[PDB]
Amino acid sequence: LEPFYVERYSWSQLKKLLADTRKYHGYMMAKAPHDFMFVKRNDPDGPHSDRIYYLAMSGENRENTLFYSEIPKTINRAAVLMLSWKPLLDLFVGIASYDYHQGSGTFLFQAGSGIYHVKDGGPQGFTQQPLRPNLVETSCPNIRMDPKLCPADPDWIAFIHSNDIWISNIVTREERRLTYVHNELANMEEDARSAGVATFVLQEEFDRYSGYWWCPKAETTPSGGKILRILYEENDESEVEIIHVTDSFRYPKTGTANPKVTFKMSEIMIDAEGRIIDVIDKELIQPFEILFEGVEYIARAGWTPEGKYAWSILLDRSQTRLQIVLISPELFIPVEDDVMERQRLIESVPDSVTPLIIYEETTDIWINIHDIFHVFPQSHEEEIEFIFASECKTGFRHLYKITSILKESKYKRSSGGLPAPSDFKCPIKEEIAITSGEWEVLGRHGSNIQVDEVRRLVYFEGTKDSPLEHHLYVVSYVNPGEVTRLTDRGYSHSCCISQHCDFFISKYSNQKNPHCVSLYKLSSPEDDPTCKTKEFWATILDSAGPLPDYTPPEIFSFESTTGFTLYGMLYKPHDLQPGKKYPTVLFIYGGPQVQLVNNRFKGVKYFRLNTLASLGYVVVVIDNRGSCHRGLKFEGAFKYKMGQIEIDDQVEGLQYLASRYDFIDLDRVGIHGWSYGGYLSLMALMQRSDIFRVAIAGAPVTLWIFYDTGYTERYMGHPDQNEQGYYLGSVAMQAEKFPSEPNRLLLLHGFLDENVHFAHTSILLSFLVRAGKPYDLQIYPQVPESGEHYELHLLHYLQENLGSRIAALKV
Amino acid sequence: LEPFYVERYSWSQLKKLLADTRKYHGYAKAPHDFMFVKRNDPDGPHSDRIYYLAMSGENRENTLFYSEIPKTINRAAVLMLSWKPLLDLFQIASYDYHQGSGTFLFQAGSGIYHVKDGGPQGFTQQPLRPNLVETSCPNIRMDPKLCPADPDWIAFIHSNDIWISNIVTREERRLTYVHNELANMEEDARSAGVATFVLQEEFDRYSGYWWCPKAETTPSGGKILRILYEENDESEVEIIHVTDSFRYPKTGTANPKVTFKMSEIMIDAEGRIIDVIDKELIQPFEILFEGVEYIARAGWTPEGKYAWSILLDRSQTRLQIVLISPELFIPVEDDVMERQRLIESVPDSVTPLIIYEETTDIWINIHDIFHVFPQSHEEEIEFIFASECKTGFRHLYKITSILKESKYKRSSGGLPAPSDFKCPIKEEIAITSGEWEVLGRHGSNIQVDEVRRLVYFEGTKDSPLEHHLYVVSYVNPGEVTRLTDRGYSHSCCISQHCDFFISKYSNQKNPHCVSLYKLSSPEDDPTCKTKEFWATILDSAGPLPDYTPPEIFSFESTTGFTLYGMLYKPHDLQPGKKYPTVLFIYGGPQVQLVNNRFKGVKYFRLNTLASLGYVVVVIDNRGSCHRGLKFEGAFKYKMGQIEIDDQVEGLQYLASRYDFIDLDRVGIHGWSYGGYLSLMALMQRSDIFRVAIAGAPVTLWIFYDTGYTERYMGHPDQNEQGYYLGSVAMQAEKFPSEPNRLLLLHGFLDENVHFAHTSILLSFLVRAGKPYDLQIYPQVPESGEHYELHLLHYLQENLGSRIAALKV
Ligand SMILES: *C(=O)C(CC)(CC)C(=O)Nc1cccc(C(=O)N2CCN(Cc3ccc(Br)cc3)CC2)c1
Ligand SMILES: *C(=O)C(CC)(CC)C(=O)Nc1cccc(C(=O)N2CCN(Cc3ccc(Br)cc3)CC2)c1
């Protein structure tokens, strides 16, 4: 077997080969249609059942904006209907999201500096032409964030300005600040209080972006006015670590203080004319730490559908205990300066009115927070019926229908004592498994459920058919049995369901076929409303079909000494020669919450894995233990042991490939990844120098004590209880183990990285220097220009130090 | 001509090699800051005790020693003075001394300490216990100084304000109220008695206040002590950040607002403070000294009648020496009416006195030479100054200026005109002259003998490659007598008594020695001076066994100047074979690399390189110093445009004389201005230079400071083209498209050449699609060893070795 040697291109020639083949800037294309909403036309004479509204980019260099398409009552089943995108807004930055109120037809969105509104599909009817956006007028000096329509009165919006909540009336022009917690004309180290804003760790590590929730119902007052309510989180970041990059912000490093959090409630009195009478800020009747002992993080919150109770999903610091809590507005009382007056209000609140833990669970691995939580209309004063998803019972996420009894508590506030841990716990009347099996329901990154309350069905997405494809399923929540798959095999799907439960949209792709979006009509046979069938209705987005210049990889699997099937992707060298062994590049992520190996189109983001194969590299990707869509036990393998197990699985997979394929030259293996991938690239060269000639680490984690609480503690615990795993997991603390031979270690980092600070790369550099070890470095100090330089530099480095003829001579 | 290829060592082999040969760390302080105190004991064996600072061997604290100078020596033998420690180990970078009381004052760590030796209370025979100056001040005290008028009183800086403290009464007292330590650097940018960044970094002025050397007595039998001090407002000055913040005037932006202030301290007969009166200039600094941007130097006349100052314009092409009577200052009074009364009480006759003014089309070079003779007429001041402005070489002038009443009378409510305060010049006499310079920077100064009417000075008169000590009469200047011996470069000081001198001297072959020399006169002519060796203070180890020195060479440039260089020949030079060449460069103003000194400490690794098979070259291009103003002035407005021509010229000269130089395998390497020229070399002359390794390069002249950049390049508005052509970062498209030719090295927290220079360059290299290599040293012995290791390996893999030739 002769070594294959990649063509040795000049710098200028690699630059040209890359620019000639370059297809997409920043590893993304036009954002496919998304955030769909179905509105019925309710027009017996007309040809259309529904209008769909959605966000999309019509082209590559376009803004994300609002479109609608018409859903015909009938189609020609001989042909394929392509829906035409009619713009909703009359435009001469982008819209990331929007709000809608069914009853009025009011849209509300942010677009750059402005909050705007328009009306369509309400009582005022359906436009045939683009609408002019109506700017909501403000006096606020700074940009307004996170606007939301009051579901009980669409003349009212809320929004954030300089970390306080304001409200504003789009009819009357009345604008009112509700919270006085932050001073814009002040320092960041002096003022670390914020209302209605999710803090860094909740945004980055729990994907909660909003910190305030309109109560969905008005309370009518005896005057003929009403009360609106906003539940909001209030945060004090004073004790939280501050870090600067070239300004600065509050980053809870692992084992340090998270913010100090609480629930507040703004109570807003409006008269018969829609003008504010008064605004009463309310606080909890006893402080947060008393009512919810042991709770670090407010993971999710909202209201029950009639607005009787607020709810929250609450996590302990170790993220191994989860509680769902009902929080009556009655637990809130005016913020009172007068201790005398204040004392009266506290006793004016009955002892019966205390928090209600309707659900609690624990695990020895970790809680994976998700967006599934559906509350049924209350049928009885002292019962709540809901659907929630959990891995805690079987180690795969499944749907459970639960009924919790709303008991009066043992604990009495009057007695002047403190509550016991189980004093607010609610008895569980009923806990039925809706789903079960060796596969998971999806509840993250847009995956959710739709509940049909008429037919007593729940639509959900899951791994049931294959851990490599997401599919849409329907099942009864009343007498769970048959789970019906609604999407077709040989694609991975990403769906949403009409609110009306009679249509679904799928965005779908596979290894060979770029992404498409199609609409499917849902029906039931006349005899059984419980049974669901689907028919193709129309295409929303066609793909351009297979790219002529992209060769997909093949999915492979292998049974592993660890007891699991591990999946991988193999990119065979183009124009493959017989009796020639070729240099190999392992591309890796390997960290929690991500899966690289599945049946999806890889030709956009991972196009350059194809470019590499095209130059003569074997490219390999493997999802090691710790990767997702394989259940909690598979995910849990590296708890406390991050960095210790991932390279075994990668090497196992590589030896699998090399015994099965003799074109793989194990003498010439490179590894490359970003972030956790950068981490595992370094660990690889450190631990398995015999396997890996070269490691290129992008934005690596090098010291877990420099990373945040929400992520690090979940997988590695508090550092005080895992000094040894933090040590063995931190590449920076083990610089001595890297090779004493140059051209083997390349570090790549942005200077202004907000997630994986440059601090990781500079502390590693500091320890590499102490240990007298060599390293190559590239810095991208700000754009498409940076990305081209990286790709150019990476190809040139692999050529010169792995693949080329000269590479072999250099040793 | 068959190419030599260096032995291709592994990383581990190179690390071992460096560590085996490593003789020094971070490139021990030789005795320095000497002082001579007379014994005045007719029966004792010694004339003088000398005090100095030194480290007693490496990895040791700089501290105070003394040695005994014997009245006589055995002229057959060589006397090695003993180092006697002056200080006991505790419960030093500089020191102050008060002759009359024998008081030493110095900072050591967070403490200010004092001891007594050599005054009335006599001479210790054992280490003395340092006495702490006790304080209530929370933060570190800086820049402590004895009041020459009263050695019980010290001043110091605390949180950018001036304080005084009595080492006997223990009274402590804050004099100035300009800074609040609690407030942030964006809000509070005022300081008193403290030299700001550009004056410390670009003009070597470290102190910003000066004790008046005389007390005025009061009616009561008390006294008034005075401190002249500069007050700075940095509010308008650019701020920069490093992993705190600091005030850095970027070229073309604002320098601090500056003024003089006077603190008037009333002391009663028992030595207690009665009162402190803060005083300000009768009219603003901008009115009294028009066009003055920088306070370069300040002090007092020897009797304390005037404060003096050397003032520069922003272009640094006008220098003025100004006398400032304490009567120009009035109490700070916010009471509008009372203030007016105070203004009226100051006579019109009291006025700034410009005793000297000079201009140049090149630049003013600030130096430390300024001697004021005692006044013998209220109408006149006699002094010795040094200047390049008359001939283009720095010479000593003896000047007498007439202190006349000014035409400007303050009461007439006008503003003064530019020449209103100019004093006439009664006399200007050249003391030295010729195609050579007097040294006045980095410790070089003069000692004036006012009995024999001689001045001692150092100079290049004998050669541009050696500094020598000289003496000449300042009355009938003629014969200049060299006192140091040829074949060494000397760095000297003279006893205040003008009867001894010390020299620290070395040459290419011989490491640094320090020796004491007795000065005397033939009985018939006291103006005639001879020297005799007296003793060794510091013996050298003799020639290093490891180290092979370079050879100094010169070539007659097409530019019309002789240019000097150093050549390290490859070790075990094989005939017929040609070796790869590393050019080491600085090439910037105020520095000379090529001279007759020992290069075996700092430039040792140039010898390691030669030991591996590299020809090493060093050349002093035009712009370098010790060759006069015209030579230095070559790159005025044109930094980066001439230096590499001189480098290549000397390289081509060496190559045509020596077949053993492989011109196809030349690398260049430098730090700072040398990193700058390393980048310029690769950019302008990729035909000559395979590899450029640039350490802490300047890449963008508008990111460097006012004091340096504007001196040599002017205001960026007056020099668009020089600033563009001189700024590497603006020309990233002119770099090679071939990788492994360009390596950048930078510290991340560099306070002098900011990392910003390297990051802006990388931004433009990336935008232009250009390759580069980078090493960062993120905060030391550790860093030094890694750099030497990476640099040897980089040159091996990309210039010198078999593999390097194959690679292209
Ligand atoms: C890590 O989590 C981080 C950085 C903190 C998150 C933003 C990260 O992922 N950073 C990142 C930087 C740059 C690019 C990418 C990235 O997504 N890709 C996609 C795949 N591409 C593979 C590739 C590309 C080119 C070649 Br020549 C070979 C292989 C890598 C960059 C992520
Ligand atoms: C520039 O003015 C600066 C950086 C702002 C001032 C501190 C600078 O000069 N920096 C600097 C950093 C590190 C070392 C040095 C230095 O003076 N030397 C000594 C000379 N030495 C020659 C050498 C050493 C080793 C080898 Br393998 C070859 C040549 C280089 C560094 C200055």
Swiss-Prot record, chain A:
GO CC, any one term: cytosol
Q: What PANTHER family does this protein's entry cite?
A: DIPEPTIDYL PEPTIDASE 8 (PTHR11731:SF98), PROTEASE FAMILY S9B,C DIPEPTIDYL-PEPTIDASE IV-RELATED (PTHR11731)
Q: How is its activity regulated?
A: Inhibited by zinc. Inhibited by the serine proteinase inhibitor 4-(2-aminoethyl)benzenesulphonyl fluoride (AEBSF), and by di-isopropylfluorophosphate. Specifically inhibited by isoindoline derivatives. Inhibited by Val-boroPro (Talabostat, PT-100), a non-selective inhibitor, which triggers pyroptosis in monocytes and macrophages.
Encoded by which gene? DPP8
Reported impact of D753A = Abolishes activity; no effect on subcellular location
The protein's pH behavior is summarized as: Optimum pH is 7.4-8.5. Little activity below pH 6.5.
- Which Gene3D superfamilies has this protein been placed in? alpha/beta hydrolase, Dipeptidylpeptidase IV, N-terminal domain
What happens when you mutate D371F? Reduced dimerization and reduced enzyme activity
**Protein name (database record):** Dipeptidyl peptidase 8
Compartments where located: Cytoplasm
Per the entry, what induces it? In activated T-cells.
From Swiss-Prot, chain B:
Question: What protein am I looking at?
Answer: Dipeptidyl peptidase 8
The alphabetized list of GO BP terms reads: apoptotic process; immune response; negative regulation of programmed cell death; proteolysis
Q: Does the keyword Cytoplasm apply?
A: yes
- What causes induction of this gene? In activated T-cells.
Identify the PANTHER family for this entry: DIPEPTIDYL PEPTIDASE 8 (PTHR11731:SF98), PROTEASE FAMILY S9B,C DIPEPTIDYL-PEPTIDASE IV-RELATED (PTHR11731)
| Gene Ontology MF annotations | aminopeptidase activity; dipeptidyl-peptidase activity; serine-type peptidase activity
How does this protein's activity depend on the pH of its environment? Answer: Optimum pH is 7.4-8.5. Little activity below pH 6.5.
Q: Which SUPFAM superfamilies match?
A: alpha/beta-Hydrolases, DPP6 N-terminal domain-like
**Record's catalysed reaction(s):** Release of an N-terminal dipeptide, Xaa-Yaa-|-Zaa-, from a polypeptide, preferentially when Yaa is Pro, provided Zaa is neither Pro nor hydroxyproline
Gene source species: Homo sapiens (Human)
Tissue specificity of this protein: Ubiquitously expressed, with highest levels in testis, placenta, prostate, muscle and brain.
What InterPro entries would the database entry show?
AB_hydrolase_fold, Dpp_8/9_N, Peptidase_S9_cat, Peptidase_S9B_N, Serine_Prot_S9B/DPPIV
Q: What is its EC number?
A: 3.4.14.5
A cellular component term from Gene Ontology for this protein is: cytosol
